[PDB]
Design a protein around this ligand. Structure first.
Ligand SMILES: [Mg+2]
Ligand SMILES: [Mg+2]
Lengths: 101, 112, 100, 138, 100, 132, 66, 197
């Protein structure tokens, strides 16, 4: 019942990324230092590379929660510029007015 | 329950409705406390900040000690994790290094 | 570029305030930053970015079948779908389609 | 004529523990509307005067956050719609309060905080030196 | 010199609300608070008074029936502090083993 | 020409309410906001979740009271409380109104986990500000 | 909308009666309540921040309104 | 029968000397049938007047103060005096407060609207104490000022310790007090390496 299949793929990515966040954080710490032996750090490089692709946080996209637009989204409201303006221009967003100066 | 019914009457005014909600736990209790109902397992401040007790199983000296000292320093500065979550991080490292002892021995690092 | 006194006093304050005590380069200082905050994937804004569209869509569909919610939109596409059957533009059977 | 003969007053029990001492309470309130902050200040000041609290009011400078958006759904980059959010402030500074007095006053004014108005209460608490610091152990 | 600190006063969470309620008396011009304060909706007879409350109770019962019939839709807990009373009720036995 | 939320002049026979008669450049000059919360204040959090709740509530109330609403909702939030103020018509029987008030207040309190109140104001007919 | 003289007369009676309640609400003397106190009371009771003052809540004598 | 007719507004039964706080005891939306004021609102059309109060959505949008009239406020505070305690008369001025209570703890509470009361900014605790109120000799004072760093302000001679490590405010308060303790005792301790100054 999500807006489209693209939103649905991002919903699964956000869920998988959450499930693997701790495991990924622990393995990365082993890699992001010069203290541990390079042999151990090389095994960690393979381990984090073998985790499912959709667990990588960089693959998450901030899409509009109402229309699924991947660009023109305001992060504070999570709305596309077209959807935000529709609500703001109707006086339905508390405290947001047209700017004139 | 029958004794509650005999004293039961409809809400008489706005204040009474607020009182009923407060007693039921629906309405917030004032003055507003931002930590109302949240206790981190009654953990003391020393539990969060001092985490070296958990590093006893690890080697007293060496690269692993230095690395784990950095891990605990970050965990001690984390206000978003409970004490239980912080111990989980350290425990995972105890297991990980136990599995990689062969590699650590090749690097002249003695673990346990 | 520090005196022995200044260096040992800076190391004492670091122990007192819970900072890194051993000499650590900027690269390895990332381990401290990694564990001092929540991972981006663990933040509420990230994994709770979308509203649960399943709950909203399914709830309001149930309330419509119960007679308590009037869905003007769903009524509009039920009348259109109803007129397309009388016109012959009905959805075909899956598998037993025009092609084969 | 139909007046309650007697009224059950809420029970307030004096404890055996010393009360907290507040040097200052800084009740900062934010709002999009200035007139609402004017009415709230009149309320909160009048409430303090009736309870014997010492209150001083000042108005911090307002903050306006502006941002721009595209006006059309497609192309036409030269044409923009600009929106703003105005945040007005009013700082209510109480002085020389006690833990009990602060609890009552804060509850009273927080419960009457009008919709669209936020609050940030900075409570300075007077404290005494810890027993350990009274003298060195070495 | 010694300073005497006043003894703390402790009251119940509802004491302040109760103190404010004692100040107000019944408004003689208004119908009971339970009813909607609107000329069209205000009850205009002893029978309407009863029926209007019964209709409101029926509405509450219908909602409760739906809430318990479909708990999945009302399981997203966003309240802090948690409110146990606003959660769905589960009336079916969850232990299927035949034992004491 | 600008289009956003502008009811366009006709032959002088289209009744418009006071809200519908004012274009977006009056939202802080002649008309107010239909929702009041703190999310959009400086340094405040959770503006996104407050917006999704407002959008849902306006749709829920439109379908729950079909043909009864005479104007837009006024959503009010004070602390934990949520207050919905609706101007409705005097066509539906009072019994049905009381049923829908008790039903919507209960169903929404369990959905958003907060005490919700619905304050209905009845009007004989839609209040016409002008004829466009 | 045409306002006949009888309608205006009923509006004046409404203002005089409403004027007494407003004095009772604010705890002032109904007999010395002036138009400048009415404006101050309405501004407090119905706080409006609308930039245009002609859009704000008003309680004036019908002779000055109509 | 004919359609249900709405009763006349109950403002017609209200006396000009009624107890208004009883009509609006708590915060409630503006009800034109309950407020006996001919208040008008709305930008008037040409040769028009502001809209009446009935069905006026602008008045419904205002957060009114009808429940907080000067009469109600004075009556409310009279019932709330029993809950208050008396400020110690000895602590007349701020200088007297500093002498008897040298330490000051600042905390903040945030009141916002919504279903969740949680705010991550409320955990922060700030402890301020003037080094002149502490029993510090010459050596101890110099060592302390070096250990704290920028936490000490020479102009005001105030040591500010901000703590936000722990989830809760009580834990950050206990940590702020603990840091002051170890700083005081550690400053007094004289190490052999201090001779290399
Ligand atoms: Mg990207
Ligand atoms: Mg243009």
């Amino acid at each position: 019942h999500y807006v489209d299949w693209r939103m649905w793929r991002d919903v699964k990515r956000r869920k998988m990324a959450y499930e693997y966040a701790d495991e990924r954080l622990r393995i990365n710490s082993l890699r992001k230092n010069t203290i541990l032996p390079k042999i151990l750090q090389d095994v960690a490089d393979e381990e984090i590379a073998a985790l499912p692709r959709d667990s990588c946080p960089v693959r998450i996209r901030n899409r509009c929660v109402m229309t699924s637009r991947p660009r023109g989204v305001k992060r504070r409201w999570r709305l596309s510029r077209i959807v935000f303006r529709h609500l703001a221009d109707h006086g339905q967003l508390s405290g947001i007015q047209r700017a004139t100066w | 329950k029958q004794l509650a019914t005999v004293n039961e009457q409809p809400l008489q005014n706005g204040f009474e409705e607020l009182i009923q909600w407060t007693k039921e736990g629906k309405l917030w209790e004032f003055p507003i406390n931002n930590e109302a109902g949240f206790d981190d397992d009654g953990s003391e401040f020393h539990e969060h900040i001092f985490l070296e007790k958990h590093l006893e199983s690890f080697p007293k000296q060496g690269p692993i000690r230095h690395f784990m000292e950095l891990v605990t320093c970050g965990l001690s500065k984390n206000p978003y994790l409970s004490v239980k979550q912080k111990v989980e991080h350290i425990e995972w490292f105890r297991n990980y290094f136990n599995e990689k002892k062969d590699i650590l021995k090749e690097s002249n690092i003695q673990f346990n | 570029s520090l005196s022995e006194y200044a260096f040992r006093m800076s190391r004492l304050s670091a122990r007192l305030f819970g900072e890194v005590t051993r000499p650590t380069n900027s690269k390895s200082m990332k381990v401290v930053k990694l564990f001092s905050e929540l991972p981006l994937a663990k933040k509420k804004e990230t994994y709770d970015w979308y509203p649960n569209h399943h709950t909203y869509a399914e709830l309001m569909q149930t309330l419509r079948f119960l007679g308590l919610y009037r869905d003007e939109h769903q009524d509009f596409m039920d009348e259109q779908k109803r007129l397309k059957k009388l016109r012959g533009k009905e959805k075909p059977k899956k598998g037993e389609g025009k092609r084969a | 004529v139909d007046v309650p003969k007697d009224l059950t007053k809420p029970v307030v029990t004096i404890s055996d523990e010393p009360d907290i001492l507040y040097k200052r309470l800084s009740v900062l309130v934010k709002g999009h509307d200035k007139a609402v902050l004017d009415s709230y200040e009149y309320f909160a000041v009048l409430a303090a005067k009736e309870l014997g609290i010492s209150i001083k009011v000042h108005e911090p400078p307002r903050k306006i956050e502006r941002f721009t958006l595209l006006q059309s759904v497609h192309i036409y980059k030269k044409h923009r719609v600009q929106y703003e959010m105005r945040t007005l402030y009013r700082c209510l500074e109480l002085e020389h309060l006690t833990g009990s007095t602060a609890d009552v006053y804060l509850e009273y004014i927080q419960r009457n905080l009008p919709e669209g108005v936020a609050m940030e209460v900075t409570k300075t608490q007077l404290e005494q030196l810890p027993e350990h610091i009274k003298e060195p152990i070495w | 010199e010694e300073v005497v600190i006043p003894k703390k006063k402790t009251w119940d969470k509802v004491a302040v609300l109760q103190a404010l309620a004692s100040t107000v008396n019944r408004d003689t011009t208004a119908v009971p608070y339970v009813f909607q304060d609107d000329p069209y909706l205000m009850p205009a007879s002893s029978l309407e008074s009863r029926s209007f409350l019964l209709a409101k109770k029926s509405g509450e019962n219908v909602a409760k029936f739906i809430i318990n019939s479909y708990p999945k839709y009302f399981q997203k807990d966003i309240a802090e502090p948690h409110i146990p009373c606003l959660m769905p009720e589960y009336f079916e036995p969850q232990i299927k083993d035949i034992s004491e | 020409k600008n289009r956003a939320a502008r009811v366009r002049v006709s032959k002088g026979d289209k009744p418009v309410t006071y809200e519908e008669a004012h274009a977006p450049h009056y939202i802080a000059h002649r008309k107010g906001w239909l929702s009041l919360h703190t999310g959009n204040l400086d340094g405040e959090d959770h503006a996104a979740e407050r917006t999704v709740e407002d959008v849902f509530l306006r749709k829920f109330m439109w379908g729950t009271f079909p043909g009864c609403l005479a104007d837009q909702l006024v959503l009010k939030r004070r602390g934990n409380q949520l207050e919905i103020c609706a101007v409705v018509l005097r066509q539906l029987s009072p019994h049905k109104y009381y049923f829908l008030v008790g039903y919507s207040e209960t169903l929404l309190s369990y959905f958003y986990k907060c005490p919700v109140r619905l304050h209905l104001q009845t009007v004989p007919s839609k209040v016409v500000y002008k004829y466009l | 909308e045409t306002y006949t003289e009888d309608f205006i007369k009923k509006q004046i009676e409404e203002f005089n009666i409403g004027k007494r309640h407003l004095a009772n609400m604010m705890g002032e003397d109904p007999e010395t309540f002036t138009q400048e106190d009415i404006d101050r009371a309405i501004a407090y009771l119905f706080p409006s921040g609308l930039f245009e003052k002609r859009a704000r809540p008003v309680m004036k004598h019908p002779e000055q309104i109509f | 029968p004919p359609r249900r007719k709405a009763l006349p507004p109950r403002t017609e039964k209200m006396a000009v000397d009624q107890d208004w706080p009883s009509v609006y005891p708590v915060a409630a939306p503006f009800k034109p049938s309950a407020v006996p004021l001919p208040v008008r609102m709305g930008y008037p059309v040409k040769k028009g007047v502001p809209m009446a109060k009935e069905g006026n959505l602008e008045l419904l949008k205002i957060p009114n103060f009808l429940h907080l009239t000067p009469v109600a406020i004075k009556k409310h505070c009279e019932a709330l005096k029993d809950f208050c305690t008396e400020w110690p008369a000895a602590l007349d001025s701020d200088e007297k407060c500093e002498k008897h209570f040298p330490i000051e703890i600042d905390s903040t509470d945030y009141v916002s609207s919504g279903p969740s009361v949680r705010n991550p900014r409320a955990r922060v605790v700030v402890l301020r104490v003037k080094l002149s109120s502490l029993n510090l000799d010459d050596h101890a004072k110099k060592k302390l000022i070096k250990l704290v760093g920028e936490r000490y302000c020479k102009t005001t001679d105030v040591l500010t310790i901000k703590t936000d490590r722990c989830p809760l405010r009580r834990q950050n308060y206990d940590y702020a007090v603990y840091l002051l303790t170890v700083l005081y005792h550690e400053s007094w301790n004289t190490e052999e390496w201090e001779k290399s100054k």
